[PDB]
């Protein structure tokens, strides 16, 4: 039951959104810049959006991390990775059982692996409701690397609600490379395929931000200061 | 109020505290025996530009193998000091090493990047701990050369803190993937010169820097303390993880969420904890405070006097003088009679009195006292009146009361020398 | 005398930073004593021109009582009145009408109130009990005999 | 407050003198001026009498003014309003170092000081002050300060009814002005409001460093030995004490403005409510024919019953 | 007034507090308070 003014790189509220709504027709998978911090969400059906490859110039020559799933469990490895035009998931649509998961090609030079708790995961094609909803920020601090996570059931058509989700510290990592160029991995369905799925991509910015933490310890509201003289009065 | 003579009044003095009775350090059960005898004390060293970031967690730290001894060359702590470096449980603490000639230690700083140290190897300003150096010119060094180990002195900017690059880049100036040794196309890459009779800025160093990353977790690296129990309602001292201080201890009523650790309240004071073997504690450490303020009658009439505990509910009091806990604590004195009410608090040495009088010495809310007796308050004369119509009081005989008045005009006309 | 040079200049940097905050704080509360001791002042100047140079009819700013009179003496560093004041303490209990109905219109005595119908015989002053005689001097005419409480015959 | 606790910063506190006793000699004084100030606007009777329960004096009625026994509070409903009007910003227990001591004279003191003020008001005579009493019915009383205003007495007896009416109006639209409205109850919420920032503001400068390591006690003295802590301990002692006399000071100052508004005070309820004062514009806006005071949180609410004439015609002369 | 301009001379600032917002608030605390004189003082009529 306070307010608390914090400086930390946080997403500005109503700013812009870099949507890649992918189809059978229309392939998103390009590099992105990094770029101080992004924000990540992903309406899914049964977790396609496993994947996320962090690097510096995307080819051998460049240290970069890969946070993946193996449909059982959280594998993080960082080590100089021979980074194709197209790594995949195939993923098979009667049964989803990853054969060819092909994208550990070559490893020298490695220093880090990680690979955390095992916990339940699905893999294979469904449709209906946008029931799954990740909400991400990786983001980049004094060298680490941080990991946030945080869930909302959602039935939207095909854009982002509007509403507060508040996120929760799972990861942080020691790594200490020059993350500059990313991308993500999605799943080839089996001639490739997705479903009516997209997700999305926002950047960060070091603002100062008013918190609205209730009595029982949870933000139920938040203001920008930078966006608005009005926000800037509330955050005053 | 240095005299010998004093008036009648409630006279301000000095301010009572119940001194901790108790100890209560609170580690986690995790005892283990550290890897520092083998990353301290290794064979194999890193390059520079590959400088190695080991985890050391889930640990009891000693803390006593970098001061007991000479070996060490340059031991010299930035966020920390020495002696009481076993006071504090960390969280993942990591140990970065490299190994660099007798000159680049000077360049081992928060701040002054200057000439290797800036490509290579960077380090914060806030985030801390010490940083270890010694000598192997016993080891490393050879006079007929020792062309094995290697770092960077050609990139294209500076490096943000904690970030490390291996990539072996034909450097140019506009990007430009070279065939060396072309015109302005050279190699980042330079050997070291570790020889033996050469002079001491040549000689090999190994440069260890333990970042020390301060309580991002339920803590696990620890020193070599004893956990003891815990006493709840009663004012003790404290050693949690990363948190001292004097406290009264007391089950709480929170909503604790389970990443988490510490509980400050809504104006940035600590107030409620959670202890390191499952259990989510308050902490009011105001174990009690305030201020005594002696009621005397006068010194010509009487000379037996009454304190008055401010801000204590005559509990902590009677608890804290006869088990003889305060800081005010006298020779003489003692606890027969206790007022308590109108929360202004304690009063020794009182007594009710339901025959209310016209309030001689301002005891706090409402209760006044004189003589020695603390009843509430005479408000007046109570009165009530004869309220019909037409009967009137004229006054029919008067006087004449000449009533003095005082008025201040014109205090002391002071003057400062404010060079003497 | 146990010092050289510019390590004793930190020590003495020390010193008049202190004795300066100190001086500095004394200046700021005797500036504030003297905002209050002008307001006393201020007092002090109005009630000897409003008390002493005359008679100020204001309640309860003089003295206490009616304020009579008002004498000045000199203090140390300050004054000290002596209000004469008028303290009327005796009551009697004495019955009222608020009106006079003589010839069927009604009466009003001076606006100076407590017509003394102490069955139906004077009319007095506020405060000092003195009885004067109903008469056209001591009343007035007004309306008629309709907005009345008490009742008062034979104003001659 | 300086100097959260341990014991060697106490060493280090003494060595800046007696300020500590400066400051608690100050605040000590100013909480005794403050007990003055609200015993010299309120307790100015000493014959304090009895409400007399009948509270209907020619339609004048007392309602909501004067308290009611049949309701657990011994206040009246206009001072229940003002007290729930204004909002804040066992014995409590915080290491601030700072508190709030309690009032000497009682919340219900008050109400019956303020209820013995306006029973004297209504019943006891206008010789109120000088004396006792002098048990005048009331009309007789507004009778009376028909004079003090140039008008007849013919006004009152053969408007009874009418100014009744008017006044107990009056008192119900003050009873409307009052609950469902805002900002003019402004002064008091402004002492409220100025006193919270100021202690908010000192304890927002207990989390701020001064140019040390970091801006807290006991958790420095984990990773500091010895002269080079006291370094860092001396820059928080002297911050943290620039900070409290800088409170110190502007109490004080507000203070002095806080007693220039009660001498203020304790003038209008010995002018305005203890007789009748004929200087213009000062008790009320009108020719202010009676007074009324009401206690309130951290104040005092009069209720000037003034008097307003709004016709006109055109006599020649 | 306080530290002309650079960049770090103001870190150097913000790590004395939030003195520079409380000399705000008393300054405009005082310009309101002679705005409330002005008005006092001049503003008793009405009907001009």
């Given at each position: 039951?306070?307010?608390?003014?914090?400086?930390?790189?946080?997403?500005?509220?109503?700013?812009?959104?870099?949507?890649?709504?992918?189809?059978?027709?229309?392939?998103?998978?390009?590099?992105?810049?990094?770029?101080?911090?992004?924000?990540?969400?992903?309406?899914?059906?049964?977790?396609?959006?496993?994947?996320?490859?962090?690097?510096?110039?995307?080819?051998?020559?460049?240290?970069?991390?890969i946070?993946?799933?193996?449909?059982?469990?959280?594998?993080?490895?960082?080590?100089?990775?021979?980074?194709?035009?197209?790594?995949?998931?195939?993923?098979?649509?009667?049964?989803?059982?990853?054969?060819?998961?092909?994208?550990?090609?070559?490893?020298?030079?490695?220093?880090?692996?990680?690979?955390?708790?095992?916990?339940?995961?699905?893999?294979?094609?469904?449709?209906?409701?946008?029931?799954?909803?990740?909400?991400?920020?990786?983001?980049?601090?004094?060298?680490?690397?941080?990991?946030?996570?945080?869930?909302?059931?959602?039935?939207?058509?095909?854009?982002?609600?509007?509403?507060?989700?508040?996120?929760?510290?799972?990861?942080?990592?020691?790594?200490?490379?020059?993350?500059?160029?990313?991308?993500?991995?999605?799943?080839?369905?089996?001639?490739?395929?997705?479903?009516?799925?997209?997700?999305?991509?926002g950047?960060?910015?070091?603002?100062?931000?008013?918190?609205?933490?209730?009595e029982?310890?949870?933000?139920?509201?938040?203001?920008?200061?930078?966006?608005?003289?009005?926000?800037?009065?509330?955050?005053s | 109020?240095?005299?010998?003579?004093?008036?009648?009044?409630?006279?301000?003095?000095?301010?009572?505290?119940?001194?901790?009775?108790?100890?209560?350090?609170?580690?986690?059960?995790?005892?283990?025996?550290?890897?520092?005898?083998?990353?301290?004390?290794?064979?194999?060293?890193?390059?520079?530009?590959?400088?190695?970031?080991?985890?050391?967690?889930?640990?009891?730290?000693?803390?006593?193998?970098?001061?007991?001894?000479?070996?060490?060359?340059?031991?010299?702590?930035?966020?920390?000091?020495?002696?009481?470096?076993?006071?504090?449980?960390?969280?993942?603490?990591?140990?970065?090493?490299?190994?660099?000639?007798?000159?680049?230690?000077r360049?081992?700083?928060?701040?002054?990047?200057?000439?290797?140290?800036?490509?290579?190897?960077?380090?914060?300003?806030?985030?801390?701990?010490?940083?270890?150096?010694?000598?192997?010119?016993?080891?490393?060094?050879?006079?007929?050369?020792n062309?094995?180990?290697?770092?960077?002195?050609?990139?294209?900017?500076?490096?943000?803190?904690?970030?490390?690059?291996?990539?072996?880049?034909?450097?140019?100036?506009?990007?430009?993937?070279?065939?060396?040794?072309?015109?302005?196309?050279?190699?980042?890459?330079?050997?070291?010169?570790?020889?033996?009779?050469?002079?001491?800025?040549?000689?090999?160093?190994?440069?260890?820097?333990?970042?020390?990353?301060?309580?991002?977790?339920?803590?696990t690296?620890?020193?070599?303390?004893?956990?003891?129990?815990?006493?709840?309602?009663?004012?003790?001292?404290?050693?949690?993880?990363?948190?001292?201080?004097?406290?009264?201890?007391?089950?709480?009523?929170?909503?604790?969420?389970?990443?988490?650790?510490?509980?400050?309240?809504?104006?940035?004071?600590?107030?409620?904890?959670?202890?390191?073997?499952?259990?989510?504690?308050?902490?009011?450490?105001?174990?009690?405070?305030?201020?005594?303020?002696?009621?005397?009658?006068?010194?010509?009439?009487?000379?037996?006097?009454?304190?008055?505990?401010?801000?204590?509910?005559?509990?902590?009091?009677?608890?804290?003088?006869?088990?003889?806990?305060?800081?005010?604590?006298?020779?003489?004195?003692?606890?027969?009679?206790?007022?308590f009410?109108?929360?202004?608090?304690?009063?020794?040495?009182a007594?009710?009195?339901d025959?209310?009088?016209?309030?001689?010495?301002?005891?706090?809310?409402?209760?006044?006292?004189?003589?020695?007796?603390?009843?509430?308050?005479?408000?007046?004369?109570?009165?009530?009146?004869a309220?019909?119509?037409?009967?009137?009081?004229?006054?029919?005989?008067?006087?004449?009361?000449?009533?003095?008045?005082?008025?201040?005009?014109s205090?002391?006309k002071?003057?400062?020398?404010?060079?003497? | 005398?146990?010092?050289?040079?510019?390590?004793?200049?930190?020590?003495?940097?020390?010193?008049?930073?202190?004795?300066?905050?100190?001086?500095?704080?004394?200046?700021?509360?005797?500036?504030?004593?003297?905002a209050?001791?002008?307001?006393?002042a201020?007092?002090?100047?109005?009630?000897?021109?409003?008390?002493?140079?005359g008679?100020?009819?204001?309640?309860?700013?003089?003295?206490?009582?009616?304020?009579?009179?008002?004498?000045?003496?000199?203090?140390?560093?300050?004054?000290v009145?002596?209000?004469?004041?008028?303290?009327?303490?005796?009551?009697?209990?004495?019955?009222?009408?608020?009106?006079?109905?003589?010839?069927?219109?009604a009466?009003?005595?001076?606006?100076?109130?407590?017509?003394?119908?102490?069955?139906?015989?004077?009319?007095?002053?506020?405060?000092?009990?003195?009885?004067?005689?109903?008469?056209?001097?001591?009343?007035?005419?007004?309306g008629?005999?309709?907005?009345?409480?008490?009742?008062?015959?034979?104003?001659? | 407050?300086?100097?959260?606790?341990?014991?060697?910063?106490?060493?280090?506190?003494?060595?800046?003198?007696?300020?500590?006793?400066?400051?608690?000699?100050?605040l000590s004084?100013?909480?005794?001026?403050?007990?003055?100030?609200?015993?010299?606007v309120?307790?100015?009777?000493?014959?304090?009498?009895?409400?007399?329960?009948?509270?209907?004096?020619?339609?004048?009625?007392?309602?909501?003014?004067?308290?009611?026994?049949?309701?657990?509070?011994?206040?009246?409903?206009?001072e229940?309003?003002?007290?729930?009007?204004?909002?804040?910003?066992?014995?409590?227990?915080?290491?601030?170092?700072?508190?709030?001591?309690?009032?000497?004279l009682?919340?219900?003191?008050?109400?019956?000081?303020?209820?013995?003020?306006?029973?004297?008001t209504?019943?006891?005579?206008?010789?109120?002050?000088?004396?006792?009493?002098?048990?005048?019915?009331?009309?007789?009383?507004?009778?009376?300060?028909?004079?003090?205003?140039?008008?007849?007495?013919?006004?009152?007896?053969?408007?009874?009814?009418?100014?009744?009416?008017?006044?107990?109006?009056?008192?119900?639209?003050?009873?409307?002005?009052?609950?469902?409205?805002?900002?003019?109850?402004?002064?008091?919420?402004?002492?409220?409001?100025?006193?919270?920032?100021?202690?908010?503001?000192?304890?927002?400068?207990?989390?701020?460093?001064?140019?040390?390591?970091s801006?807290?006690?006991?958790?420095?003295?984990?990773?500091?030995?010895?002269?080079?802590?006291?370094?860092?301990?001396?820059?928080?002692?002297?911050?943290?004490?620039?900070?409290?006399?800088?409170?110190?000071?502007?109490?004080?100052?507000?203070?002095?403005?806080?007693?220039?508004?009660?001498?203020?005070?304790?003038?209008?309820?010995?002018?305005?409510?203890?007789?009748?004062?004929?200087?213009?514009?000062?008790?009320?806006?009108?020719?202010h024919?009676?007074?009324?005071?009401?206690?309130?949180?951290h104040?005092?609410?009069?209720?000037?019953?003034?008097?307003?004439?709004?016709?006109?015609?055109?006599?020649t002369?």
């Amino acid at each position: 039951d306070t307010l608390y003014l914090t400086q930390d790189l946080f997403l500005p509220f109503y700013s812009n959104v870099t949507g890649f709504h992918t189809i059978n027709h229309t392939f998103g998978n390009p590099v992105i810049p990094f770029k101080d911090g992004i924000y990540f969400a992903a309406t899914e059906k049964s977790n396609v959006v496993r994947g996320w490859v962090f690097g510096s110039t995307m080819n051998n020559k460049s240290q970069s991390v890969i946070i993946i799933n193996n449909s059982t469990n959280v594998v993080i490895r960082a080590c100089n990775f021979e980074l194709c035009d197209n790594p995949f998931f195939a993923v098979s649509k009667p049964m989803g059982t990853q054969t060819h998961t092909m994208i550990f090609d070559n490893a020298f030079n490695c220093t880090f692996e990680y690979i955390s708790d095992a916990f339940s995961l699905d893999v294979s094609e469904k449709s209906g409701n946008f029931k799954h909803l990740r909400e991400f920020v990786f983001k980049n601090k004094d060298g680490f690397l941080y990991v946030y996570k945080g869930y909302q059931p959602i039935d939207v058509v095909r854009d982002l609600p509007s509403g507060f989700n508040t996120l929760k510290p799972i990861f942080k990592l020691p790594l200490g490379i020059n993350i500059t160029n990313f991308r993500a991995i999605l799943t080839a369905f089996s001639i490739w395929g997705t479903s009516a799925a997209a997700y999305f991509v926002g950047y960060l910015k070091p603002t100062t931000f008013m918190l609205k933490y209730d009595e029982n310890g949870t933000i139920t509201d938040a203001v920008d200061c930078s966006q608005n003289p009005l926000a800037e009065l509330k955050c005053s | 109020v240095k005299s010998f003579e004093i008036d009648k009044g409630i006279y301000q003095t000095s301010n009572f505290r119940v001194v901790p009775s108790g100890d209560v350090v609170r580690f986690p059960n995790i005892t283990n025996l550290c890897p520092f005898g083998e990353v301290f004390n290794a064979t194999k060293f890193p390059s520079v530009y590959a400088w190695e970031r080991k985890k050391i967690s889930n640990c009891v730290a000693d803390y006593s193998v970098l001061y007991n001894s000479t070996f060490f060359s340059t031991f010299k702590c930035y966020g920390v000091s020495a002696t009481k470096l076993n006071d504090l449980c960390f969280s993942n603490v990591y140990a970065d090493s490299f190994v660099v000639k007798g000159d680049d230690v000077r360049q081992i700083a928060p701040g002054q990047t200057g000439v290797i140290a800036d490509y290579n190897y960077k380090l914060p300003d806030d985030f801390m701990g010490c940083v270890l150096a010694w000598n192997t010119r016993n080891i490393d060094a050879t006079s007929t050369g020792n062309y094995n180990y290697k770092y960077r002195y050609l990139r294209h900017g500076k490096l943000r803190p904690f970030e490390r690059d291996i990539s072996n880049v034909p450097f140019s100036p506009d990007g430009k993937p070279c065939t060396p040794p072309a015109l302005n196309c050279y190699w980042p890459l330079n050997d070291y010169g570790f020889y033996t009779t050469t002079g001491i800025g040549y000689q090999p160093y190994r440069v260890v820097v333990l970042s020390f990353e301060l309580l991002n977790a339920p803590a696990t690296v620890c020193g070599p303390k004893l956990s003891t129990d815990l006493i709840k309602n009663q004012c003790v001292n404290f050693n949690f993880n990363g948190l001292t201080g004097t406290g009264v201890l007391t089950p709480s009523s929170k909503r604790f969420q389970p990443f988490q650790q510490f509980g400050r309240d809504v104006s940035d004071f600590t107030d409620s904890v959670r202890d390191p073997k499952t259990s989510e504690i308050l902490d009011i450490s105001p174990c009690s405070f305030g201020g005594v303020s002696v009621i005397t009658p006068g010194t010509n009439a009487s000379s037996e006097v009454a304190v008055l505990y401010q801000d204590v509910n005559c509990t902590d009091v009677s608890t804290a003088i006869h088990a003889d806990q305060l800081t005010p604590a006298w020779r003489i004195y003692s606890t027969g009679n206790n007022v308590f009410q109108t929360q202004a608090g304690c009063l020794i040495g009182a007594e009710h009195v339901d025959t209310s009088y016209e309030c001689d010495i301002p005891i706090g809310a409402g209760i006044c006292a004189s003589y020695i007796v603390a009843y509430t308050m005479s408000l007046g004369a109570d009165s009530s009146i004869a309220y019909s119509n037409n009967t009137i009081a004229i006054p029919t005989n008067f006087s004449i009361s000449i009533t003095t008045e005082v008025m201040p005009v014109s205090m002391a006309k002071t003057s400062v020398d404010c060079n003497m | 005398s146990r010092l050289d040079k510019v390590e004793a200049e930190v020590q003495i940097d020390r010193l008049i930073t202190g004795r300066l905050q100190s001086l500095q704080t004394y200046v700021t509360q005797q500036l504030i004593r003297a905002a209050e001791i002008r307001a006393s002042a201020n007092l002090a100047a109005t009630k000897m021109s409003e008390c002493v140079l005359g008679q100020s009819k204001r309640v309860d700013f003089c003295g206490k009582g009616y304020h009579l009179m008002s004498f000045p003496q000199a203090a140390p560093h300050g004054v000290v009145f002596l209000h004469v004041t008028y303290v009327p303490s005796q009551e009697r209990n004495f019955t009222t009408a608020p009106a006079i109905c003589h010839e069927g219109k009604a009466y009003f005595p001076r606006e100076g109130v407590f017509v003394f119908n102490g069955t139906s015989w004077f009319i007095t002053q506020r405060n000092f009990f003195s009885p004067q005689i109903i008469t056209t001097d001591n009343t007035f005419v007004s309306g008629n005999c309709d907005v009345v409480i008490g009742i008062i015959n034979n104003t001659v | 407050y300086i100097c959260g606790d341990s014991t060697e910063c106490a060493n280090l506190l003494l060595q800046y003198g007696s300020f500590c006793t400066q400051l608690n000699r100050a605040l000590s004084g100013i909480a005794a001026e403050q007990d003055r100030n609200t015993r010299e606007v309120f307790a100015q009777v000493k014959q304090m009498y009895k409400t007399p329960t009948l509270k209907y004096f020619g339609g004048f009625n007392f309602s909501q003014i004067l308290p009611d026994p049949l309701k657990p509070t011994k206040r009246s409903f206009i001072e229940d309003l003002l007290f729930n009007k204004v909002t804040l910003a066992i014995c409590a227990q915080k290491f601030n170092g700072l508190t709030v001591l309690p009032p000497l004279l009682t919340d219900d003191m008050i109400a019956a000081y303020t209820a013995a003020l306006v029973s004297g008001t209504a019943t006891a005579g206008w010789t109120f002050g000088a004396g006792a009493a002098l048990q005048i019915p009331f009309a007789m009383q507004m009778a009376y300060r028909f004079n003090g205003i140039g008008v007849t007495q013919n006004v009152l007896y053969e408007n009874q009814k009418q100014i009744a009416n008017q006044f107990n109006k009056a008192i119900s639209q003050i009873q409307e002005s009052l609950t469902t409205t805002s900002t003019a109850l402004g002064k008091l919420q402004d002492v409220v409001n100025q006193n919270a920032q100021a202690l908010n503001t000192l304890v927002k400068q207990l989390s701020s460093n001064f140019g040390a390591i970091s801006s807290v006690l006991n958790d420095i003295l984990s990773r500091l030995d010895k002269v080079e802590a006291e370094v860092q301990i001396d820059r928080l002692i002297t911050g943290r004490l620039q900070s409290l006399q800088t409170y110190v000071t502007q109490q004080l100052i507000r203070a002095a403005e806080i007693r220039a508004s009660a001498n203020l005070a304790a003038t209008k309820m010995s002018e305005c409510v203890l007789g009748q004062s004929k200087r213009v514009d000062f008790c009320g806006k009108g020719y202010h024919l009676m007074s009324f005071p009401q206690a309130a949180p951290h104040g005092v609410v009069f209720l000037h019953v003034t008097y307003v004439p709004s016709q006109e015609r055109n006599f020649t002369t």
